Protein backbone atom coordinates (compact mmCIF):
# COMPACT_ATOMS: atom_id res chain seq x y z
CA UNK A 1 0.00 0.00 0.00
CA UNK A 2 2.25 3.41 -1.68
CA UNK A 3 -0.59 5.79 0.10
CA UNK A 4 -0.03 3.92 3.53
CA UNK A 5 3.84 3.96 3.19
CA UNK A 6 4.07 7.59 2.14
CA UNK A 7 2.01 8.48 5.14
CA UNK A 8 4.34 7.00 7.46
CA UNK A 9 7.22 8.64 6.20
CA UNK A 10 5.70 11.43 6.87
CA UNK A 11 4.57 11.36 10.22
CA UNK A 12 8.32 10.13 10.21
CA UNK A 13 9.27 13.33 9.12
CA UNK A 14 6.82 15.05 11.39
CA UNK A 15 8.28 13.55 14.48
CA UNK A 16 12.22 14.24 13.60
CA UNK A 17 12.12 17.58 11.83
CA UNK A 18 10.49 20.78 13.80
CA UNK A 19 10.62 23.15 11.31
CA UNK A 20 8.52 22.24 8.57
CA UNK A 21 7.87 24.07 5.13
CA UNK A 22 4.56 24.51 6.30
CA UNK A 23 5.36 26.23 9.36
CA UNK A 24 8.44 28.65 7.71
CA UNK A 25 5.92 29.40 4.38
CA UNK A 26 3.82 31.02 7.20
CA UNK A 27 6.07 32.78 9.16
CA UNK A 28 7.65 33.86 5.80
CA UNK A 29 4.55 35.86 5.22
CA UNK A 30 8.09 38.58 13.54
CA UNK A 31 11.13 36.36 13.25
CA UNK A 32 14.04 39.02 13.99
CA UNK A 33 16.43 40.61 11.39
CA UNK A 34 20.18 39.38 11.13
CA UNK A 35 21.72 41.78 8.58
CA UNK A 36 25.07 42.84 10.08
CA UNK A 37 27.74 43.00 13.24
CA UNK A 38 25.66 44.61 15.82
CA UNK A 39 22.29 42.78 15.04
CA UNK A 40 23.97 39.01 15.15
CA UNK A 41 25.26 40.19 18.35
CA UNK A 42 21.66 41.24 19.72
CA UNK A 43 20.53 37.80 17.99
CA UNK A 44 23.03 35.84 20.30
CA UNK A 45 22.27 38.39 23.45
CA UNK A 46 18.86 36.09 23.70
CA UNK A 47 16.65 37.35 21.50
CA UNK A 48 17.01 34.87 18.82
CA UNK A 49 19.80 32.50 20.73
CA UNK A 50 36.43 38.00 13.27
CA UNK A 51 32.24 37.80 12.02
CA UNK A 52 32.94 35.28 8.63
CA UNK A 53 33.77 32.54 10.85
CA UNK A 54 31.44 33.21 13.25
CA UNK A 55 29.02 32.88 10.64
CA UNK A 56 30.69 29.27 9.59
CA UNK A 57 30.60 28.49 13.35
CA UNK A 58 26.77 28.86 13.53
CA UNK A 59 26.18 27.09 10.22
CA UNK A 60 28.30 24.21 11.74
CA UNK A 61 25.86 23.91 14.77
CA UNK A 62 22.71 24.08 12.68
CA UNK A 63 24.02 21.59 10.09
CA UNK A 64 25.24 18.74 12.69
CA UNK A 65 21.42 19.01 14.76
CA UNK A 66 20.07 18.30 11.34
CA UNK A 67 22.52 15.47 11.06
CA UNK A 68 20.72 14.36 14.48
CA UNK A 69 17.78 14.74 13.57
CA UNK A 70 18.46 12.92 9.94
CA UNK A 71 20.18 10.03 11.66
CA UNK A 72 16.52 9.68 13.65
CA UNK A 73 14.35 9.95 10.96
CA UNK A 74 16.19 7.02 8.94
CA UNK A 75 15.44 4.73 11.81
CA UNK A 76 12.39 5.01 10.56
CA UNK A 77 12.02 4.37 6.92
CA UNK A 78 11.31 0.41 6.66
CA UNK A 79 14.09 -1.54 5.93
CA UNK A 80 16.51 0.88 7.11
CA UNK A 81 17.64 -0.26 10.34
CA UNK A 82 18.02 -3.75 9.58
CA UNK A 83 20.95 -3.21 7.41
CA UNK A 84 24.06 -3.84 8.77
CA UNK A 85 25.88 -0.91 10.99
CA UNK A 86 28.28 0.12 9.15
CA UNK A 87 25.94 -0.04 5.88
CA UNK A 88 23.69 2.74 7.95
CA UNK A 89 26.94 4.98 8.14
CA UNK A 90 27.91 5.47 4.74
CA UNK A 91 24.16 6.09 3.79
CA UNK A 92 24.14 8.57 6.29
CA UNK A 93 27.79 9.69 6.12
CA UNK A 94 26.67 10.71 2.16
CA UNK A 95 23.38 11.14 2.12
CA UNK A 96 23.18 13.83 4.96
CA UNK A 97 24.44 16.84 3.61
CA UNK A 98 22.06 16.19 0.01
CA UNK A 99 19.27 15.76 2.41
CA UNK A 100 20.44 19.18 4.39
CA UNK A 101 20.40 21.41 1.07
CA UNK A 102 17.20 19.82 -0.22
CA UNK A 103 15.65 21.19 3.28
CA UNK A 104 17.11 24.13 3.66
CA UNK A 105 15.13 25.14 0.76
CA UNK A 106 11.92 25.37 3.21
CA UNK A 107 13.18 28.00 4.73
CA UNK A 108 15.03 29.97 1.84
CA UNK A 109 13.47 33.12 0.04
CA UNK A 110 15.80 34.86 -2.48
CA UNK A 111 16.05 37.38 -0.08
CA UNK A 112 18.00 35.26 3.30
CA UNK A 113 16.76 32.38 5.52
CA UNK A 114 14.81 31.42 8.95
CA UNK A 115 17.61 30.59 12.23
CA UNK A 116 16.85 28.91 15.43
CA UNK A 117 13.76 27.78 14.92
CA UNK A 118 11.98 30.48 12.69
CA UNK A 119 13.27 33.48 15.66
CA UNK A 120 15.04 35.10 13.28
CA UNK A 121 15.79 35.70 9.62
CA UNK A 122 19.31 36.11 8.29
CA UNK A 123 19.66 37.79 5.11
CA UNK A 124 21.44 36.80 2.15
CA UNK A 125 23.38 39.67 1.39
CA UNK A 126 24.82 39.99 4.72
CA UNK A 127 26.00 36.08 3.97
CA UNK A 128 27.29 37.52 0.45
CA UNK A 129 29.27 39.85 2.37
CA UNK A 130 31.79 37.71 4.30
CA UNK A 131 35.36 36.90 3.53
CA UNK A 132 35.36 34.97 0.50
CA UNK A 133 36.13 31.48 1.65
CA UNK A 134 32.58 30.88 3.25
CA UNK A 135 30.36 33.76 1.13
CA UNK A 136 30.28 31.89 -2.09
CA UNK A 137 30.11 28.26 0.39
CA UNK A 138 26.81 29.19 1.34
CA UNK A 139 25.82 31.50 -2.26
CA UNK A 140 25.50 28.03 -4.11
CA UNK A 141 22.65 26.55 -1.45
CA UNK A 142 20.92 29.75 -2.07
CA UNK A 143 21.23 29.40 -5.95
CA UNK A 144 19.79 25.52 -5.78
CA UNK A 145 17.50 26.49 -2.96
CA UNK A 146 15.42 29.19 -5.05
CA UNK A 147 14.88 27.17 -8.02
CA UNK A 148 13.98 23.98 -6.03
CA UNK A 149 11.01 25.93 -4.31
CA UNK A 150 9.62 26.67 -7.92
CA UNK A 151 8.36 22.93 -7.95
CA UNK A 152 6.61 23.73 -5.27
CA UNK A 153 6.75 20.44 -3.01
CA UNK A 154 5.15 20.33 0.77
CA UNK A 155 6.20 18.52 3.75
CA UNK A 156 4.53 14.96 2.44
CA UNK A 157 6.27 15.16 -0.67
CA UNK A 158 9.87 16.36 0.80
CA UNK A 159 9.62 13.30 3.53
CA UNK A 160 10.08 10.90 0.75
CA UNK A 161 12.34 12.90 -1.54
CA UNK A 162 15.15 13.11 1.98
CA UNK A 163 13.83 9.07 2.65
CA UNK A 164 15.30 8.77 -0.96
CA UNK A 165 17.72 10.40 -1.12
CA UNK A 166 19.25 8.74 2.23
CA UNK A 167 18.72 5.57 0.60
CA UNK A 168 21.47 5.44 -2.44
CA UNK A 169 22.73 2.36 -3.51
CA UNK A 170 25.38 3.89 -5.36
CA UNK A 171 27.30 5.35 -2.46
CA UNK A 172 30.77 4.66 -2.48
CA UNK A 173 31.69 1.66 -0.23
CA UNK A 174 28.44 0.33 0.49
CA UNK A 175 28.07 -3.31 1.44
CA UNK A 176 24.89 -4.77 0.64
CA UNK A 177 24.09 -2.61 -2.89
CA UNK A 178 20.94 -4.60 -3.91
CA UNK A 179 19.36 -4.72 -0.76
CA UNK A 180 19.43 -0.92 -0.49
CA UNK A 181 18.88 -0.14 -3.77
CA UNK A 182 15.61 -2.97 -3.22
CA UNK A 183 14.61 -0.16 -0.12
CA UNK A 184 14.79 2.78 -2.42
CA UNK A 185 12.94 1.11 -5.20
CA UNK A 186 10.08 0.83 -2.75
CA UNK A 187 10.19 4.56 -1.91
CA UNK A 188 10.60 5.79 -4.95
CA UNK A 189 7.53 3.59 -6.57
CA UNK A 190 5.78 5.63 -3.24
CA UNK A 191 7.29 8.82 -4.21
CA UNK A 192 6.00 8.46 -7.98
CA UNK A 193 2.90 7.30 -6.30
CA UNK A 194 2.16 10.09 -3.99
CA UNK A 195 2.97 13.03 -6.75
CA UNK A 196 0.15 11.93 -8.32
CA UNK A 197 -2.13 12.07 -5.87
CA UNK A 198 -0.75 15.20 -4.58
CA UNK A 199 0.24 16.99 -7.41
CA UNK A 200 -2.09 15.70 -10.25
CA UNK A 201 -1.49 18.34 -12.90
CA UNK A 202 1.96 18.41 -12.47
CA UNK A 203 3.39 17.10 -15.29
CA UNK A 204 7.24 15.64 -15.51
CA UNK A 205 7.49 17.01 -11.62
CA UNK A 206 8.87 12.71 -10.80
CA UNK A 207 11.74 12.61 -13.33
CA UNK A 208 12.41 16.20 -12.29
CA UNK A 209 13.10 15.57 -8.80
CA UNK A 210 14.93 11.92 -10.28
CA UNK A 211 17.24 15.02 -11.64
CA UNK A 212 17.45 16.86 -8.21
CA UNK A 213 18.72 14.38 -6.56
CA UNK A 214 21.75 14.45 -9.14
CA UNK A 215 21.87 17.92 -8.92
CA UNK A 216 22.26 18.07 -4.94
CA UNK A 217 24.95 15.25 -5.59
CA UNK A 218 27.28 17.35 -7.54
CA UNK A 219 26.28 20.51 -5.03
CA UNK A 220 27.49 18.10 -1.74
CA UNK A 221 30.29 17.30 -3.79
CA UNK A 222 31.23 20.52 -4.80
CA UNK A 223 30.67 21.49 -0.93
CA UNK A 224 32.82 19.06 0.36
CA UNK A 225 35.64 20.02 -2.14
CA UNK A 226 35.53 23.38 -0.36
CA UNK A 227 34.64 22.04 3.66
CA UNK A 228 38.10 20.08 2.78
CA UNK A 229 40.08 22.80 1.32
CA UNK A 230 39.23 25.44 4.04
CA UNK A 231 40.39 22.52 6.73
CA UNK A 232 43.96 23.10 5.13
CA UNK A 233 43.96 26.99 3.96
CA UNK A 234 42.33 28.13 7.36
CA UNK A 235 44.48 27.13 9.94
CA UNK A 236 42.61 29.05 12.69
CA UNK A 237 39.31 28.13 12.16
CA UNK A 238 37.94 24.39 13.64
CA UNK A 239 35.42 22.34 12.25
CA UNK A 240 33.11 20.26 14.28
CA UNK A 241 34.73 16.84 14.43
CA UNK A 242 31.60 14.81 13.18
CA UNK A 243 31.33 16.99 10.19
CA UNK A 244 35.62 16.34 10.18
CA UNK A 245 34.54 12.40 10.35
CA UNK A 246 31.58 13.02 7.24
CA UNK A 247 33.84 15.12 4.54
CA UNK A 248 37.33 12.64 5.75
CA UNK A 249 37.78 10.37 2.10
CA UNK A 250 34.50 11.89 0.69
CA UNK B 1 27.72 0.10 42.31
CA UNK B 2 30.64 -2.12 40.79
CA UNK B 3 28.87 -5.14 42.01
CA UNK B 4 25.72 -4.14 40.06
CA UNK B 5 27.56 -3.17 36.88
CA UNK B 6 29.31 -6.66 36.53
CA UNK B 7 26.17 -8.70 37.01
CA UNK B 8 24.14 -6.05 34.29
CA UNK B 9 27.19 -7.26 32.40
CA UNK B 10 27.06 -10.33 33.00
CA UNK B 11 23.75 -10.87 32.02
CA UNK B 12 23.77 -9.04 28.54
CA UNK B 13 26.45 -11.64 28.18
CA UNK B 14 24.27 -14.84 29.06
CA UNK B 15 21.79 -13.41 26.39
CA UNK B 16 23.49 -12.55 23.62
CA UNK B 17 25.94 -15.83 23.84
CA UNK B 18 24.54 -19.36 23.71
CA UNK B 19 27.50 -21.24 24.41
CA UNK B 20 29.14 -20.23 27.59
CA UNK B 21 32.46 -21.64 29.02
CA UNK B 22 30.34 -23.15 31.81
CA UNK B 23 28.21 -25.33 29.30
CA UNK B 24 31.41 -25.96 26.86
CA UNK B 25 33.68 -26.84 30.11
CA UNK B 26 30.64 -29.35 30.82
CA UNK B 27 30.61 -30.85 27.08
CA UNK B 28 34.27 -31.02 27.36
CA UNK B 29 34.16 -33.33 29.87
CA UNK B 30 24.10 -35.33 27.71
CA UNK B 31 25.55 -37.20 24.78
CA UNK B 32 29.17 -36.61 23.45
CA UNK B 33 29.85 -34.67 20.52
CA UNK B 34 30.21 -36.30 16.74
CA UNK B 35 34.18 -35.95 15.82
CA UNK B 36 35.51 -33.85 12.83
CA UNK B 37 39.01 -35.12 11.67
CA UNK B 38 39.16 -35.57 7.87
CA UNK B 39 36.94 -35.35 5.08
CA UNK B 40 34.54 -37.87 5.21
CA UNK B 41 33.66 -36.99 9.27
CA UNK B 42 33.01 -33.31 8.36
CA UNK B 43 30.81 -34.90 5.30
CA UNK B 44 28.96 -36.53 7.80
CA UNK B 45 29.07 -34.09 9.89
CA UNK B 46 27.59 -31.73 7.36
CA UNK B 47 24.50 -34.54 6.66
CA UNK B 48 22.59 -33.50 9.25
CA UNK B 49 25.12 -34.81 11.92
CA UNK B 50 26.54 -31.33 13.25
CA UNK B 51 24.92 -28.94 10.89
CA UNK B 52 21.71 -29.04 9.20
CA UNK B 53 39.87 -28.45 -1.57
CA UNK B 54 39.01 -29.55 1.90
CA UNK B 55 41.15 -26.94 3.40
CA UNK B 56 38.72 -23.76 1.47
CA UNK B 57 36.12 -25.89 2.94
CA UNK B 58 36.94 -25.59 6.61
CA UNK B 59 37.76 -21.74 5.99
CA UNK B 60 34.15 -20.88 4.80
CA UNK B 61 32.97 -22.95 8.13
CA UNK B 62 35.00 -20.79 9.74
CA UNK B 63 33.77 -17.53 8.14
CA UNK B 64 30.44 -18.59 8.78
CA UNK B 65 31.26 -19.09 12.79
CA UNK B 66 32.71 -15.85 12.82
CA UNK B 67 30.31 -13.85 11.20
CA UNK B 68 28.00 -15.10 13.77
CA UNK B 69 29.73 -13.99 16.43
CA UNK B 70 30.33 -10.88 14.49
CA UNK B 71 26.48 -10.73 14.62
CA UNK B 72 26.23 -11.69 18.55
CA UNK B 73 28.86 -9.07 19.45
CA UNK B 74 27.18 -6.36 18.05
CA UNK B 75 24.10 -7.24 19.97
CA UNK B 76 26.09 -7.90 23.01
CA UNK B 77 27.50 -3.98 22.40
CA UNK B 78 23.91 -2.24 22.65
CA UNK B 79 23.90 -3.35 26.22
CA UNK B 80 27.44 -2.16 27.66
CA UNK B 81 26.27 1.01 28.90
CA UNK B 82 26.83 4.14 27.35
CA UNK B 83 27.88 2.14 23.97
CA UNK B 84 24.28 3.07 22.16
CA UNK B 85 24.80 6.51 22.96
CA UNK B 86 27.97 7.02 20.80
CA UNK B 87 27.34 8.30 17.62
CA UNK B 88 26.81 5.60 15.51
CA UNK B 89 29.87 5.99 13.40
CA UNK B 90 32.37 5.94 16.85
CA UNK B 91 30.26 2.47 17.41
CA UNK B 92 31.31 1.40 13.79
CA UNK B 93 34.96 1.76 14.69
CA UNK B 94 34.32 0.10 17.79
CA UNK B 95 33.13 -3.36 16.52
CA UNK B 96 35.36 -2.89 13.37
CA UNK B 97 38.96 -2.91 15.30
CA UNK B 98 37.45 -5.20 18.46
CA UNK B 99 35.05 -7.93 17.27
CA UNK B 100 38.11 -10.26 16.35
CA UNK B 101 39.76 -9.31 19.90
CA UNK B 102 36.99 -10.46 21.27
CA UNK B 103 35.85 -13.24 19.44
CA UNK B 104 39.86 -15.05 19.80
CA UNK B 105 39.51 -14.51 23.95
CA UNK B 106 35.83 -16.33 23.39
CA UNK B 107 37.17 -18.89 21.78
CA UNK B 108 39.69 -20.03 24.48
CA UNK B 109 35.75 -21.15 26.04
CA UNK B 110 35.54 -23.88 23.60
CA UNK B 111 38.81 -24.84 23.09
CA UNK B 112 41.31 -27.55 24.80
CA UNK B 113 44.68 -28.60 23.32
CA UNK B 114 43.32 -31.41 21.05
CA UNK B 115 40.68 -29.31 19.19
CA UNK B 116 37.44 -26.91 19.45
CA UNK B 117 33.75 -27.57 19.73
CA UNK B 118 31.30 -26.07 16.98
CA UNK B 119 27.70 -26.12 16.34
CA UNK B 120 26.89 -25.32 19.64
CA UNK B 121 28.89 -28.45 21.01
CA UNK B 122 27.42 -30.60 18.82
CA UNK B 123 30.79 -31.64 16.95
CA UNK B 124 34.01 -31.39 18.11
CA UNK B 125 36.88 -30.09 15.55
CA UNK B 126 40.39 -31.90 16.13
CA UNK B 127 44.04 -29.62 15.74
CA UNK B 128 45.55 -32.16 14.22
CA UNK B 129 43.22 -32.50 11.53
CA UNK B 130 43.24 -28.51 10.85
CA UNK B 131 47.31 -28.50 10.85
CA UNK B 132 46.80 -31.06 7.88
CA UNK B 133 44.64 -28.13 5.81
CA UNK B 134 46.70 -26.52 2.98
CA UNK B 135 49.82 -24.08 4.46
CA UNK B 136 47.96 -20.40 4.26
CA UNK B 137 44.56 -21.97 6.16
CA UNK B 138 46.89 -23.83 8.43
CA UNK B 139 49.08 -20.92 9.74
CA UNK B 140 45.98 -18.83 10.65
CA UNK B 141 43.71 -21.25 12.65
CA UNK B 142 47.07 -22.61 14.53
CA UNK B 143 47.87 -19.26 16.37
CA UNK B 144 44.50 -19.13 17.76
CA UNK B 145 45.12 -22.38 19.34
CA UNK B 146 48.21 -21.19 20.94
CA UNK B 147 46.43 -17.95 22.17
CA UNK B 148 43.69 -19.61 23.26
CA UNK B 149 45.41 -22.79 25.58
CA UNK B 150 47.60 -20.53 27.05
CA UNK B 151 44.98 -17.70 28.16
CA UNK B 152 42.73 -20.59 29.47
CA UNK B 153 45.61 -20.91 32.23
CA UNK B 154 44.10 -17.90 34.14
CA UNK B 155 40.82 -20.16 34.70
CA UNK B 156 38.38 -16.81 34.11
CA UNK B 157 34.70 -17.88 34.55
CA UNK B 158 31.87 -16.56 32.24
CA UNK B 159 31.12 -13.31 34.66
CA UNK B 160 34.85 -12.18 34.22
CA UNK B 161 34.68 -13.21 30.34
CA UNK B 162 32.24 -10.70 30.17
CA UNK B 163 33.80 -7.75 31.62
CA UNK B 164 36.88 -8.48 29.30
CA UNK B 165 35.57 -8.52 26.29
CA UNK B 166 33.11 -5.12 27.07
CA UNK B 167 36.49 -4.10 28.10
CA UNK B 168 37.91 -5.05 24.68
CA UNK B 169 35.14 -3.24 22.74
CA UNK B 170 35.53 0.03 24.15
CA UNK B 171 39.21 0.39 23.26
CA UNK B 172 39.67 3.92 23.01
CA UNK B 173 42.33 3.75 20.92
CA UNK B 174 41.18 2.72 17.71
CA UNK B 175 42.42 3.92 14.77
CA UNK B 176 40.06 6.83 13.52
CA UNK B 177 38.13 7.24 16.85
CA UNK B 178 35.90 10.31 16.53
CA UNK B 179 35.53 10.81 20.38
CA UNK B 180 38.46 9.37 21.96
CA UNK B 181 38.07 10.68 26.37
CA UNK B 182 34.23 9.50 26.17
CA UNK B 183 35.11 5.97 24.68
CA UNK B 184 38.37 6.37 27.38
CA UNK B 185 35.87 7.12 30.13
CA UNK B 186 33.45 4.46 29.60
CA UNK B 187 36.23 1.79 29.48
CA UNK B 188 37.78 2.60 32.58
CA UNK B 189 34.12 2.48 34.22
CA UNK B 190 34.09 -1.09 32.87
CA UNK B 191 37.75 -2.45 34.15
CA UNK B 192 37.39 -0.74 37.51
CA UNK B 193 34.73 -3.05 37.34
CA UNK B 194 36.60 -5.83 36.08
CA UNK B 195 39.39 -4.82 39.07
CA UNK B 196 36.82 -5.22 41.89
CA UNK B 197 35.55 -8.84 40.11
CA UNK B 198 38.54 -10.21 40.07
CA UNK B 199 39.52 -9.96 43.45
CA UNK B 200 36.10 -10.92 44.59
CA UNK B 201 36.14 -13.67 42.45
CA UNK B 202 39.67 -14.78 42.22
CA UNK B 203 40.67 -13.73 45.80
CA UNK B 204 44.02 -15.97 45.74
CA UNK B 205 44.76 -14.58 42.10
CA UNK B 206 46.36 -11.84 43.11
CA UNK B 207 48.37 -10.19 39.87
CA UNK B 208 45.04 -11.28 37.67
CA UNK B 209 44.26 -7.92 36.06
CA UNK B 210 47.64 -7.11 35.12
CA UNK B 211 47.98 -10.00 33.51
CA UNK B 212 44.12 -9.35 31.42
CA UNK B 213 45.66 -6.50 30.97
CA UNK B 214 48.47 -7.25 28.94
CA UNK B 215 46.25 -10.29 27.27
CA UNK B 216 44.29 -7.49 25.67
CA UNK B 217 47.76 -6.19 24.07
CA UNK B 218 48.53 -9.91 22.72
CA UNK B 219 44.85 -9.97 21.38
CA UNK B 220 45.62 -6.58 19.38
CA UNK B 221 48.67 -8.35 17.97
CA UNK B 222 47.29 -11.87 17.76
CA UNK B 223 44.43 -9.70 15.39
CA UNK B 224 46.79 -7.58 13.91
CA UNK B 225 48.61 -10.16 12.60
CA UNK B 226 45.20 -12.41 11.63
CA UNK B 227 44.15 -9.08 9.38
CA UNK B 228 47.69 -8.93 7.89
CA UNK B 229 47.23 -13.07 6.93
CA UNK B 230 43.53 -12.26 5.57
CA UNK B 231 44.67 -9.94 3.34
CA UNK B 232 46.80 -11.86 2.03
CA UNK B 233 44.46 -14.45 0.98
CA UNK B 234 42.40 -11.75 -0.97
CA UNK B 235 44.97 -11.31 -3.31
CA UNK B 236 46.71 -14.36 -3.44
CA UNK B 237 43.95 -17.09 -3.05
CA UNK B 238 42.09 -15.40 -5.61
CA UNK B 239 38.89 -18.30 -6.14
CA UNK B 240 38.44 -18.36 -2.56
CA UNK B 241 35.75 -16.14 -1.69
CA UNK B 242 35.74 -13.51 2.08
CA UNK B 243 32.24 -12.96 3.05
CA UNK B 244 31.45 -9.11 2.76
CA UNK B 245 31.04 -8.22 6.14
CA UNK B 246 34.76 -9.60 7.09
CA UNK B 247 35.93 -7.47 3.45
CA UNK B 248 34.44 -4.83 5.66
CA UNK B 249 36.51 -5.21 8.10
CA UNK B 250 39.36 -6.17 7.11
CA UNK B 251 39.13 -3.05 4.44
CA UNK B 252 42.16 -0.49 5.62
CA UNK B 253 42.36 -2.00 8.95
CA UNK B 254 46.32 -3.06 9.82
C1 LIG C 1 23.80 32.16 10.94
C2 LIG C 1 23.73 31.11 9.83
C3 LIG C 1 22.43 30.31 9.92
C4 LIG C 1 22.67 28.84 9.56
C5 LIG C 1 21.79 28.41 8.39
C6 LIG C 1 21.94 26.92 8.10
C7 LIG C 1 23.26 26.51 8.25
C8 LIG C 1 23.91 25.85 7.21
C9 LIG C 1 23.23 25.60 6.02
C10 LIG C 1 24.19 25.11 4.94
C11 LIG C 1 25.13 26.23 4.49
C12 LIG C 1 26.26 25.69 3.61
C13 LIG C 1 27.63 26.05 4.20
C14 LIG C 1 27.60 26.00 5.72
C15 LIG C 1 27.60 24.55 6.23
C16 LIG C 1 28.95 24.19 6.86
C17 LIG C 1 28.79 23.06 7.87
C18 LIG C 1 28.57 21.72 7.16
O1 LIG C 1 29.30 21.47 6.18
O2 LIG C 1 27.68 20.97 7.62
C1 LIG D 1 34.96 -26.92 10.05
C2 LIG D 1 35.79 -26.08 11.02
C3 LIG D 1 34.89 -25.19 11.88
C4 LIG D 1 35.73 -24.29 12.80
C5 LIG D 1 34.89 -23.13 13.33
C6 LIG D 1 35.58 -22.47 14.54
C7 LIG D 1 35.44 -21.09 14.50
C8 LIG D 1 36.55 -20.28 14.71
C9 LIG D 1 37.79 -20.85 14.96
C10 LIG D 1 38.81 -20.42 13.90
C11 LIG D 1 39.01 -18.90 13.91
C12 LIG D 1 40.26 -18.51 13.12
C13 LIG D 1 40.09 -18.82 11.64
C14 LIG D 1 40.16 -17.54 10.80
C15 LIG D 1 38.81 -16.83 10.75
C16 LIG D 1 38.37 -16.58 9.31
C17 LIG D 1 37.16 -15.64 9.26
C18 LIG D 1 37.40 -14.39 10.10
O1 LIG D 1 38.54 -13.88 10.04
O2 LIG D 1 36.44 -13.97 10.78
C1 LIG E 1 28.03 -3.72 11.91
C2 LIG E 1 29.11 -4.61 12.47
C3 LIG E 1 30.45 -3.89 12.43
C4 LIG E 1 31.02 -3.93 11.03
C5 LIG E 1 32.46 -3.48 11.01
C6 LIG E 1 32.86 -3.18 9.57
C7 LIG E 1 33.30 -1.73 9.48
O1 LIG E 1 33.73 -1.47 8.15
C8 LIG E 1 33.96 -0.08 7.89
O2 LIG E 1 32.71 0.57 7.60
C9 LIG E 1 32.80 1.98 7.29
C10 LIG E 1 31.44 2.48 6.79
O3 LIG E 1 30.48 2.31 7.84
C11 LIG E 1 33.83 2.29 6.20
O4 LIG E 1 34.08 3.70 6.22
C12 LIG E 1 35.15 1.53 6.40
O5 LIG E 1 35.97 1.66 5.24
C13 LIG E 1 34.88 0.05 6.66
O6 LIG E 1 36.12 -0.61 6.88
C1 LIG F 1 26.61 9.37 13.19
C2 LIG F 1 26.01 9.30 11.80
C3 LIG F 1 26.77 10.16 10.81
C4 LIG F 1 28.21 9.69 10.78
C5 LIG F 1 28.95 10.19 9.56
C6 LIG F 1 30.42 9.92 9.83
C7 LIG F 1 30.88 8.78 8.94
O1 LIG F 1 32.31 8.78 8.98
C8 LIG F 1 32.94 7.58 8.57
O2 LIG F 1 32.82 6.60 9.63
C9 LIG F 1 33.64 5.40 9.58
C10 LIG F 1 33.67 4.77 10.98
O3 LIG F 1 32.34 4.38 11.35
C11 LIG F 1 35.08 5.64 9.08
O4 LIG F 1 35.64 4.42 8.57
C12 LIG F 1 35.15 6.64 7.94
O5 LIG F 1 36.52 6.92 7.63
C13 LIG F 1 34.41 7.93 8.29
O6 LIG F 1 34.55 8.85 7.20
Same mark, same amino acid.
Not at 168 to 175: F, K, S
Given at each position: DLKAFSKHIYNAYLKNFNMTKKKARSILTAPFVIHDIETLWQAEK @? +????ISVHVFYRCQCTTVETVRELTEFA??? &?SFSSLFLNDQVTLLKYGVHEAIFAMLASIVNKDGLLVANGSGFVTREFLRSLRKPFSDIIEPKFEFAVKFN /? +?? +? #?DSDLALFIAAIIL? @? #?? &? @? +??NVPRVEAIQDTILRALEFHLQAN? &?? /??QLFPKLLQKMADLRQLVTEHAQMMQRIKKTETETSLHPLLQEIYKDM
Open positions: @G +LVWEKSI &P /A +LE +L #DC @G #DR &P @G +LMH &PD /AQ
